[PDB]
Amino acid sequence: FTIYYTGMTDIGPSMTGVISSPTYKGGTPYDFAITRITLDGEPFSDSIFAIDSETGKITLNSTSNTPVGLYKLSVACYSNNNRYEYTDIVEINMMKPVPDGIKTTEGNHISISNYTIASAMNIQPGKYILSFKLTTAATGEDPEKGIFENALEINVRPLIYTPDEGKIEEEGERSPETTFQSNIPANTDKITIDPTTGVLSVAAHHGFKDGEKSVKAVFENVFTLNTVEFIEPIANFGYADVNDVQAVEIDINKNENFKGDEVKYEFVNLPTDLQGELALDLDGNIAIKKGNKIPVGQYTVQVMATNTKGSETATFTLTITANPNYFTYFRYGNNLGLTPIENYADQFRIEAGGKLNSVKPVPTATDAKDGLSSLKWEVELKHNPNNTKATINESTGQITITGLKQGQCGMVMVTATAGEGKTAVSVKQPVFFHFSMISDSNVQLEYTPFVFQVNPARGGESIAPSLGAGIDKSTFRLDYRRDFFYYNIAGPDSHISGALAQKVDNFLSEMWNSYDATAGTSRKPMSYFENTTNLSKALGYIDQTDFKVHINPNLWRNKDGYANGAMIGQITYDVTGKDPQAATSGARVSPIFIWFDTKF
Amino acid sequence: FTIYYTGMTDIGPSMTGVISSPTYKGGTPYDFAITRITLDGEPFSDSIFAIDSETGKITLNSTSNTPVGLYKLSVACYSNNNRYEYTDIVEINMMKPVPDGIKTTEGNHISISNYTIASAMNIQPGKYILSFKLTTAATGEDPEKGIFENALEINVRPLIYTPDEGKIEEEGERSPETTFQSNIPANTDKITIDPTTGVLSVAAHHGFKDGEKSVKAVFENVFTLNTVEFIEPIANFGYADVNDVQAVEIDINKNENFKGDEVKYEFVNLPTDLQGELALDLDGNIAIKKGNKIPVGQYTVQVMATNTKGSETATFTLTITANPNYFTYFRYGNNLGLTPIENYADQFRIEAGGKLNSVKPVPTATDAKDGLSSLKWEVELKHNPNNTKATINESTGQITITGLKQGQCGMVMVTATAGEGKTAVSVKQPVFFHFSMISDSNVQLEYTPFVFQVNPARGGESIAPSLGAGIDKSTFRLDYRRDFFYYNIAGPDSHISGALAQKVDNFLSEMWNSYDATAGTSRKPMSYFENTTNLSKALGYIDQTDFKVHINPNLWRNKDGYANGAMIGQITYDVTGKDPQAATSGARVSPIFIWFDTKF
Amino acid sequence: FTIYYTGMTDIGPSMTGVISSPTYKGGTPYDFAITRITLDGEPFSDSIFAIDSETGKITLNSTSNTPVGLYKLSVACYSNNNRYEYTDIVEINMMKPVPDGIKTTEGNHISISNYTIASAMNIQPGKYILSFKLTTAATGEDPEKGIFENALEINVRPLIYTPDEGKIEEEGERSPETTFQSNIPANTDKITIDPTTGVLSVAAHHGFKDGEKSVKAVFENVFTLNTVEFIEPIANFGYADVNDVQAVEIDINKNENFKGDEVKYEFVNLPTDLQGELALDLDGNIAIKKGNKIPVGQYTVQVMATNTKGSETATFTLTITANPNYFTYFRYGNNLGLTPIENYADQFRIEAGGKLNSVKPVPTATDAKDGLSSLKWEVELKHNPNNTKATINESTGQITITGLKQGQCGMVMVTATAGEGKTAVSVKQPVFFHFSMISDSNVQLEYTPFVFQVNPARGGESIAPSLGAGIDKSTFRLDYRRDFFYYNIAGPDSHISGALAQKVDNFLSEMWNSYDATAGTSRKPMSYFENTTNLSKALGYIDQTDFKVHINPNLWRNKDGYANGAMIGQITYDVTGKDPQAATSGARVSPIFIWFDTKF
Ligand code: NA
Ligand code: NA
Ligand code: NA
Ligand code: NA
Ligand code: NA
Ligand code: NA
């Protein structure tokens, strides 16, 4: 809420109009009061100025003494139930009237050295009242700046109704007497007009039926009266108080006796911790979803219902207490020697020349209230859906992967659930795998960790990989090439998962287009060799000194938000110092997963 | 809310019972958690102890490691929506079990130097499990205090139902299937019993009618089943949100669709500023009175309804905004020369030998928003109702008194009202008068001020009076005598106004009795001369040095609260140094009003 | 200093104009910087937006990446040497361009569901560039709101120079080469024009002489070149540092080598304690007056000089140290029994029936550093100048009054001086006298104190007077009547001292007129009996219960400030309960002086 005043600075004791009016931003203010008036730096006792409690407009009280000088007014008001106070927000300069005998001077007794228009109370028909500021003195007297109030009246054939359309309802059992009255403007005998004000009126028993629809002062068709169907006013609008535990689905339905036609609903001052957690539907019922993040506590919720007949607000109390199944994480850790395990993704390498069946990870930790063993487990294979399969032991959480190809990474989503029925709580997390190999030219490309956890706002760089014993770093070249896949984890719905491909619209096609409309399915947006003249333009790239993957800042996003998900692409290498774009099948690997999350 | 734990200090690893349980005062606690466990001054990682989230009772987790030493448990819980946490509230000493071969020792290999009973898990039928604390050592080894758990079982013809009476409802359209089940204990074929537990049960279609009403294990008449009328559960219980201005009457009615039989209502966590301002009736409707003191602001109000079928809480929002008629005082001031006028009662002296018609006070000040002239005025004569009359000019507030006798004080209540209709605001205040005179022996007794504003808790003394020119202070004596009157101003209803009189029960008779059951209508409770051996016993008295009225502390009250009101009594004098009890008619005056208010 | 931004909310990556510009109040801002950019609630690394350090206007950097979303810019700048910073003061919504094939769609491949004008870069000749907001989608794709930038060019015979007048100087010894150049617009051969821009130019040796004074694109007389006399630029502008003691006169002259024609001067950031204490004259020299209130301390002073050739600021240091003669008060006290004496005016009563020569007060106290005896003394009679005389002993300060009439008050101004010569310090204070008497009907009217020290902003009331032994208060009436005098003490110069009189303009005539233009020299503005229907309108009045003088709030002032001075008027009385306006000569007294000071 913000507020300031505009209006007349200089006035005299005869001022009867509004002196100063507020302009505000935020909630419509009300209960205005003048809390202090000062005159020339000292308190002013008498109630010289008044303020309209509803509008905040300031006028002069006509019975008050009006000594000359600068007045400062302090003003208080409310907006959305809160009190605000402003010291010396309005300044009013009260001037001395000019001497008695000045017309629109009595026997040349008073001289004037300065003439200025003070105000006139684009031309309009009607009377203009002009006021002047004059500097005057009697013979031999010191000059004085005064105000010449209401000095001159200037009076200058006749119509707009705001609005010009209006509704009247057909009478019936629910409204046997209906009427109409328009605002004051600036074949049937049932519509009348007040001759002085021009207000249009209709009394009860007009006999107007639903669907049925010129003033002389001739202004033809200056108003339109529409007869319409009765709109039922809002009644019996309310919700029961609600008591439940954390993270469960709750339907909060309005009472079934609700009456009211064509109603709209909105929250009034929804508490901060409920914002985004409660959804109001078009019928005014509220949904809270399973897995919601409302903290334990007690909350007051208000809903306003509105139709053309008026508004009504209802209040209920929502109390959330502890769910005995509530928990927030589990961990499998890693077989890469990396600790603390919580500083790295859950990730497992199958050694070069090894077997997938030798690596079957079991979870190791959780904050589940009834302990690790109390959890039940599900798994969903994410990558590579064309050849990789995943299963899980429902009671232990042991994961088995089959089909993952040497030289590639895979990814699954694991869901742990505590409890059963309506109060069950589930936590879902990714687990990643890398099937290492010795590929062409004795290369054994290994990033440790092979999951690069990156903040898409800040960007960053991965660990430098090991290349394999005997590999000459100096002549090694490494670049993304093809076969890009993206899996949304907890990003916006518009971050569509899947492979970058011709004629498929998904997050990767959107990302590619953000780099260049012509990028198609090429390596360009992720390539060092295609961006050497300006690397800052790439979505990401591998450097040719250390072979880290670099992710550039703020690019991994769309209009709906930052990426929250994981990307994998095929990378190719060359061992003779050349751009590896044409590397043959045995020199192609997918050794690293990029996991974007602004929490990293 | 307060809480502490009692239970077993010393345990061993085989402990399966409740170790420690809470005793609490205040709101029933819930959502218990153990937030920390320490062992021997260091953090203990594993979840060795568990706490029941509902009861707060503490047990040992059987799969946990149990190293030896003193454990300290920190506990959190909620009470009435607030979280409380207690560091090291529970201490558990985990002991080492005694060595293997001790029976209820294996080849005299282990010696025992100390025997103590640890616990037994007034005698009762059933099995007692005994545990011991023993100090033991193998030959040549250092002695050790251990625990001997479940060492001995001691097993010692058969019934109480709590409660012993229970209700079942007759079936009908609103409840076509009704049942019954009793708690587990410690002619018809429709009542059955579980042979193992002894629970009494009745299935639907029992055919029992309203009004209609022995177990072998023979316990005759050990349970009574009463058939009763269906109690409608609470439904559609709610209130609309309420918006109004300060100090006006408001009826807050529950929605007319309410269902529910035999219901009781109470406020839940009523906000501090509404306490005493909202009244809940036996139907659950709420009244707010005209002149209520609820501050401007927005309030959340909750009401709980309860019957035998359960409880339901409803919430509404109450918003109070500024009343344009709101104000808190007016003042008439005084004609005694006393300032600031707000430090004294509104009070007017008619001079000795003067006329009542010469003193017609008009009000001088107010905080009325539209100014002094905007007020309308009413008056009510309080004293002396046997001879004094009061009128007021409705628009100016000018008071006219007639009939007040020379030598006496009078009192009126003046009511000023701002505005009209439902939003009108009224303020009621006393105004006092003293008709001075020269009485017998040239005495002109004048207290200035003649209204003694006293705090009845603290007590105090009046101003010293002027006696009149020529009066010898040394030989003057002055004492309350008779004709005592009391007028409740804003005290409890039980402070009944009126004259102290035989066979009339009012505040003065109660006050008299508090001094002495035999005081009747005598001067004694207010007399110096009747209390000279212990003045602290008097309700009040006049001293014979300065002639101040003294009011003793904490006496002017009854069981319902401190006096808030005004007292006048006849005082008599003597000019020859004697007890003035028998002063003749011309030496009797009522020159001072005592106004009691704990705000003074 | 205050600031906010206006401009374009929605942009695209092709935006090359100003996006947002500041509006400010206070000192012209400079050294603008963008201190932070966020995108969608996270830091944005790259320098996407730029800000002009001088103007604060914001543009898009064309080489930057431009991801889609809402950007928030934090801005810092300086104003008058101080740094200000504003978090998220500017918001910029970067949109996605609309798809490739949209003209001003490629084979109906993209549908549009919404058309809006984004911006057009009252009609004017020249090219308008239109941009659109469109909602679009390819067949089967989710719709997207995009921006269609530079979509349409609309191109719509020819002149204003701001300003239209300009000065060139005649050449001479001090400026042998002078030129002219006008701003770009929106008989002699020495004035030329750039054909493309229309700038008017004159090279050196134009031969134009002092006093001497049409473009085709024909705009006749569209510019006026005035030949004028050389204005000497400011040079050698400075002041010496200044060291002196408190309260002495100081002339601070600029160095005598100053050069510069037609110069104006102002202070730059004058320290608070020097404001009102240093006066800058039209030559740029500074005066500090004897009796100035500059505290001891060291001050930096800056003065800016400006003419048409530019500005130059000079700085000096002013150091004020202790004056050994510095002091602030003396006191004579009073002979009225009133203490502490500093809570009352210095004031002396000559008893009824007494002699002026019996009351010759001597001063009693001072904070003079060398003690009371070190002071020398002067006196000036203020009232009554028509009959009263005052002398003083120069070394003791003993005052002698002669000529003051029974029944009246007098007033003198006493000046005490410590030290001699340039470092002497003087303090001037009033001392008042009351020559009491028993006047008609045994009245002995005495106010104690008889100097009513009143704050003219707050108003107030005097002490109640004693009327004399035997005087009946009930029938006494007292009112100001005539012979009003006012003496300015330390008020504005416009508070002219002297008697209220016909055809004399002074503070009292001004005060009288403020009450009513018709008041003349009547009692009305100071009368109880002339204002009984609305006492709040009086300048002051005596009440008829206690006979206190009342001064109404905020009235004793004019446009230049509150009264600081003393007023005396003749008051008349009646002993028979009547308006005393016609009291004869023996019932007329001037018993009270009103001393106005906002320090009271
Ligand atoms: Na409700
Ligand atoms: Na499990
Ligand atoms: Na409700
Ligand atoms: Na009135
Ligand atoms: Na200098
Ligand atoms: Na001296």
Q: Are residues C431 and C538 in the same domain?
A: no
In this structure, which long-range contacts are made by residues C529-532, counting pairs with CB atoms below 8 Å and at least 24 apart in sequence?
Answer: C529/C479, C529/C579, C529/C581
Mutate to test the interface with A, among B315, B326, B327, B423 (most CBs of A within 10 A): B315
Query: How far does the CA of residue B338 sit from the closest CA of chain C (Å)?
Result: 10
Instruction: Name the nearest CA neighbour of C284 among C303, C302, C262, C261.
Output: C303
List the beta bridge partners of residue B51: B58
Query: How far does the CA of residue C463 sit from the closest CA of chain B (Å)?
Result: 10
The answer to whether A168 touches A180, Cβ cutoff 8 Å, is yes
Note whether A240 contacts B324, CB cutoff 8 Å. Answer: no
Q: Are residues B434 and B472 in the same domain?
A: no
Please give the structure tokens belonging to residue B379. 């008056």
Query: How far does the CA of residue A511 sit from the closest CA of chain C (Å)?
Result: 10
- What distance in Å separates the CA atoms of residue A115 and residue A106, rounded to the nearest whole number? 17
Query: How far does the CA of residue C545 sit from the closest CA of chain B (Å)?
Result: 7
- What distance in Å separates the CA atoms of residue C316 and residue C252, rounded to the nearest whole number? 10
Q: Are residues B316 and B328 in the same domain?
A: no
Phi and psi angles of residue A438, each rounded to the nearest 5 degrees, phi first: -90, 110
First to last CA, chain C: 36
**Resolution in A, one decimal?**
2.0
Helix or strand holding residue A429 (H, E): strand A425-435
Helix or strand holding residue B507 (H, E): helix B507-515
Instruction: Name the nearest CA neighbour of C144 among C93, C105, C110.
Output: C110
Please give the structure tokens belonging to residue C220. 């006749």
CB of B315 within 8 Å of a chain A CB? The answer is: yes
Which residues of chain A does B81 touch, with a Cβ-Cβ cutoff of 8 Å? 297-298, 319
List the beta bridge partners of residue A86: A75
Sign of the torsion formed by the C-alpha atoms of C367, C371, C372 and C377: negative
Note whether B322 contacts A31, CB cutoff 8 Å. Answer: yes
Instruction: Name the nearest CA neighbour of A416 among A471, A465, A480, A367.
Output: A367
Enumerate neighbours of B (3 or more CB pairs within 8 A).
A, C
- What distance in Å separates the CA atoms of residue C344 and residue C600, rounded to the nearest whole number? 10
Using DSSP, state whether B259 is helix, strand or coil. Answer: strand
Amino acid present at B303: V
Note whether A314 contacts B257, CB cutoff 8 Å. Answer: no
- Give the CATH number for residue C78: 2.60.40.2710
Q: Are residues C566 and C529 in the same domain?
A: yes
Note whether A240 contacts B241, CB cutoff 8 Å. Answer: no
Using DSSP, state whether A406 is helix, strand or coil. Answer: coil
Please give the structure tokens belonging to residue B428. 């009621």
CA A123 from chain centre, in angstroms, equals 45
Nearby residues of B580 by Cβ (< 8 Å), 6 or more positions away: B477, B478, B479, B481, B572, B573, B574, B587
Within 13 A of A230's CA, how many CA atoms are on the CB side?
15
Using DSSP, state whether C124 is helix, strand or coil. Answer: coil
- Give the CATH number for residue A593: 2.60.40.2730
Please give the structure tokens belonging to residue A69. 């000088």
Note whether A240 contacts B240, CB cutoff 8 Å. Answer: no
CB of B354 within 8 Å of a chain C CB? The answer is: yes
- Using omega within 30 degrees of 0 as the cis cutoff, is the peptide bond preceding A449 cis? yes
The answer to whether C293 touches C277, Cβ cutoff 8 Å, is yes
CB of A68 within 8 Å of a chain C CB? The answer is: yes
Nearby residues of A228 by Cβ (< 8 Å), 6 or more positions away: A167, A168, A169, A170, A210
Q: Which residues surround ligand 5, an ion (CB under 5 A)?
A: C 238
Q: Are residues B202 and B273 in the same domain?
A: no
DSSP structure class, residue A202: E
Q: Could you give the residue ranges of the DSSP H alpha helices within B286-432?
A: none
Using DSSP, state whether A185 is helix, strand or coil. Answer: coil
Stretch 122-181 of chain A: residues touching chain C, C-beta under 8 Å: 138, 141-142, 144
Q: In C183-197, which positions are buried (b, 16+ CB within 10 angstroms) versus exposed (e)? A: eebeeeeebeeeeee
Helix or strand holding residue B511 (H, E): helix B507-515
- What distance in Å separates the CA atoms of residue B211 and residue A10, rounded to the nearest whole number? 87
CB of B423 within 8 Å of a chain A CB? The answer is: no
- What distance in Å separates the CA atoms of residue A58 and residue A56, rounded to the nearest whole number? 6
- Give the CATH number for residue B224: 2.60.40.60
Query: How far does the CA of residue B351 sit from the closest CA of chain C (Å)?
Result: 8
CA-nearest residue to B335 within chain C is: C545
CB of B351 within 8 Å of a chain C CB? The answer is: yes
Note whether A96 contacts C552, CB cutoff 8 Å. Answer: no
Sign of the torsion formed by the C-alpha atoms of C505, C511, C516 and C521: negative
Q: Are residues C447 and C366 in the same domain?
A: no
Note whether B354 contacts C545, CB cutoff 8 Å. Answer: no
- What distance in Å separates the CA atoms of residue B341 and residue B345, rounded to the nearest whole number? 8
Phi and psi angles of residue B341, each rounded to the nearest 5 degrees, phi first: -65, -30
Note whether C562 contacts A40, CB cutoff 8 Å. Answer: yes
Q: Are residues C296 and C205 in the same domain?
A: no
Q: Are residues B558 and B449 in the same domain?
A: yes
Instruction: Name the nearest CA neighbour of B462 among B449, B471, B474.
Output: B449
- Using omega within 30 degrees of 0 as the cis cutoff, is the peptide bond preceding B449 cis? yes
Using DSSP, state whether A582 is helix, strand or coil. Answer: helix
C396 C-alpha to center of ligand 6: Å? 5
- The 3-state secondary structure of B292-312 reads CCCCCEEEEEEEEEEECCEEE
Q: Are residues C558 and C548 in the same domain?
A: yes
- The 3-state secondary structure of C453-490 reads EECCCCCEECCCCECCCCCCHHHCEEEEEEEEEEEECC
Using DSSP, state whether C274 is helix, strand or coil. Answer: helix
DSSP structure class, residue A173: S
Mutate to test the interface with B, among A315, A326, A366, A369 (most CBs of B within 10 A): A315
Q: Are residues C164 and C38 in the same domain?
A: no
Stretch 208-247 of chain A: residues touching chain B, C-beta under 8 Å: 236-238, 240-241
Method: X-ray
CB of B385 within 8 Å of a chain C CB? The answer is: no
Q: Could you give the residue ranges of the DSSP H alpha helices within B186-335?
A: none
Q: Percentages helix, strand, coil for chain B, rounded to the nearest 5?
A: 10, 40, 50
DSSP structure class, residue B95: P
DSSP structure class, residue A182: -
Triad A37, A39, A40: Cα angle to 5°: 145
Note whether B337 contacts C461, CB cutoff 8 Å. Answer: no
Say which ligand is closest to the CA of B416: 4
Using DSSP, state whether A303 is helix, strand or coil. Answer: strand
CB of C355 within 8 Å of a chain A CB? The answer is: no
Which residues of chain C does B351 touch, with a Cβ-Cβ cutoff of 8 Å? 474
DSSP C60-101: E-TTS---SEEEEEEEEEEETTEEEEEEEEEEEEEPPBPPTT
The answer to whether B411 touches B430, Cβ cutoff 8 Å, is yes
Say which ligand is closest to the CA of C254: 5
The answer to whether A178 touches A225, Cβ cutoff 8 Å, is no
DSSP β-ladder status, A347-350 and A425-435: parallel
Q: Any idea how long chain C is?
A: 600
The answer to whether A90 touches A20, Cβ cutoff 8 Å, is yes
Q: Are residues A365 and A294 in the same domain?
A: no
List the beta bridge partners of residue B589: B571
CA-nearest residue to C66 within chain A is: A555
Amino acid present at B348: F
The answer to whether B489 touches B568, Cβ cutoff 8 Å, is no
Please give the structure tokens belonging to residue B424. 């009108």
What are the strands, taking DSSP E only, across B61-186?
69-79, 82-94, 110-120, 127-138, 144-155, 165-169, 180-181
The answer to whether C563 touches C557, Cβ cutoff 8 Å, is yes
Helix or strand holding residue C509 (H, E): helix C507-515
A416 C-alpha to center of ligand 2: Å? 9
The answer to whether A322 touches B77, Cβ cutoff 8 Å, is no
Instruction: Name the nearest CA neighbour of A188 among A213, A215, A218, A210.
Output: A213
Q: Are residues B330 and B307 in the same domain?
A: no
Instruction: Name the nearest CA neighbour of A200 among A220, A182, A222.
Output: A182
- What distance in Å separates the CA atoms of residue C586 and residue C445, rounded to the nearest whole number? 13
DSSP structure class, residue A290: T
Per the structure, the complete domain to which residue A543 belongs is given by 439-600
Instruction: Name the nearest CA neighbour of B489 among B428, B427, B434.
Output: B428
- Number of CB atoms found within 10 A of residue C582's CB: 10
- What distance in Å separates the CA atoms of residue A120 and residue C240, rounded to the nearest whole number? 53
